[PDB]
């Protein structure tokens, strides 16, 4: 048996956003609940934590989220709440209900993505990569640049190399390689095809010498 | 708020090799009701922790038994008794015993494989970029071990810090490197006003930084 968060999404810094987390079957609904989040490619930071009714629903918080986040819970429903208000940038993260049957922060869901931004669906600039101003190998690449939301694909038309995104001043960034025998480049056509599905663009660019 | 320090941030093991982890703590993990609430999750690739061990030694429902965990009070260690393919992500401790409830940076259990130097390619901004007013100059720097590098950009000569936006991928599926993508941005204007443009990389596999540069003016 186990938990199944929902209720995050895109929201404006803030904002404010209510997070629900379901138990599964068993059979108790004594036992305490927690809330645990984590950035993009960052560590796990704890936020919350409500006891069950015998314990008086005791909440605590981390110092992050005080007087800004409440955690709370309906035991009729089978619910634990996450009530996020005055909503910030760094409140970005996957956030996580995090419990035990008797074995502490044992059962983890999938999680439920918040993102905090100002942000605008933003159709990516797609730059060629080519050298230069003479070996076996050639590498070539596109710069995939100023995007919202998230998803962009690179596909190279496999030693491709796809590097994560980076968040710039409210806008993605990403950038892919191909490398590729000399004997194929410039003498055939090497393109990469960039879709972005949110802004509806799909990029072709062949790389020219 | 209870400081919960890893060592060590980074382990390169073989597959079948033991390894072990350490956890370490700001003050005692002991509860006044006499327990021990320092717990191990592994997180892997795309996922969500999973529980290992939890107060300290206790093995979670179906973890493997090549999983254990040792210490006492402030003193941490999680061993791996043969690492196996599946074991690889991110390893946490994590402490319940004092509020805020807190966790250690991670560490991450990565492939052992030999020292490879990286391929660097640097690239001019694009005629596409130029139009627009922009100027984006990027380096590759593409299949090296261990993953430790640092990349300089030099505009004619000087280091330049402002502009710069660095992308590391994890270690590959096949032959288990570390590749890099670093580019200096300014304006079309800016570009235009200068014209050696050079990124250096420095890496365990010389002692002589990596330079890569193009002059603009040529290009």
């Known amino acids: 048996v186990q938990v199944v968060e929902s209720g995050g999404g895109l929201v404006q810094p803030k904002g404010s956003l209510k997070l629900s987390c379901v138990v599964s079957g068993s059979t108790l609904n004594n036992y305490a609940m927690n809330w645990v989040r984590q950035a993009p490619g960052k560590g796990l930071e704890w936020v919350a934590r409500?006891?069950?009714?015998?314990?008086?629903?005791?909440?605590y918080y981390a110092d992050s989220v005080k007087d800004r986040f409440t955690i709370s819970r309906d035991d009729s429903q089978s619910m634990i709440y996450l009530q996020m208000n005055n909503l910030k940038t760094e409140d970005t993260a996957m956030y996580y209900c995090?419990?035990?049957?008797?074995?502490?922060?044992?059962?983890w869901g999938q999680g439920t993505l918040v993102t905090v931004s100002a942000a605008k669906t933003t159709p990516p600039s797609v730059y060629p990569l080519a050298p230069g101003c003479t070996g076996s190998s050639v590498t070539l690449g596109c710069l995939v640049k100023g995007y919202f939301p998230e998803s962009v694909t690179v596909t190279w038309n496999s030693s491709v190399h796809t590097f994560p995104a980076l968040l710039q001043s409210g806008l993605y960034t990403m950038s892919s390689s191909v490398t590729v025998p000399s004997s194929t480049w410039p003498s055939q056509t090497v393109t990469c095809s960039v879709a972005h599905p949110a802004s509806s663009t799909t990029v072709d660019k062949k790389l020219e010498p | 708020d209870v400081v919960m320090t890893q060592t060590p941030l980074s382990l390169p093991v073989s597959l079948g090799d033991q390894a072990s982890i350490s956890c370490r703590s700001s003050?005692?993990?002991?509860?006044?009701?006499?327990?021990?609430?320092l717990h191990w999750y592994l997180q892997k690739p795309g996922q969500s922790p999973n529980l290992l061990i939890y107060?300290?030694?206790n093995r979670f429902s179906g973890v493997p038994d090549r999983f254990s965990g040792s210490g006492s009070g402030t003193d941490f260690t999680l061993k791996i008794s043969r690492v196996e393919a599946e074991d690889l992500g991110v390893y946490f401790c994590s402490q319940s015993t004092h509020v805020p409830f807190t966790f250690g940076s991670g560490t991450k259990l990565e492939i052992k494989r030999a020292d490879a130097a990286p391929t660097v390619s640097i690239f001019p901004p694009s005629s596409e970029q130029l139009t627009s007013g922009g100027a984006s100059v990027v380096c590759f720097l593409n299949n090296f071990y261990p993953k430790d590098i640092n990349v300089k950009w030099k505009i004619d000569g000087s280091e330049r810090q402002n502009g710069v936006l660095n992308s590391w991928t994890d270690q590959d599926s096949k032959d288990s490197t570390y590749s890099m993508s670093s580019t200096l941005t300014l304006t079309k204007d800016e570009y235009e006003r200068h014209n050696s443009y050079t990124c250096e990389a420095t890496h365990k596999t010389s002692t002589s930084p990596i330079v890569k540069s193009f002059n603009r003016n040529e290009c």
């Open positions: 409500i006891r069950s009714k015998s314990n008086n629903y005791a909440t």
């Open positions: 003050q005692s993990l002991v509860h006044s009701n006499g327990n021990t609430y």
């Open positions: 107060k300290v030694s």
């Open positions: 995090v419990t035990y049957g008797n074995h502490p922060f044992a059962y």
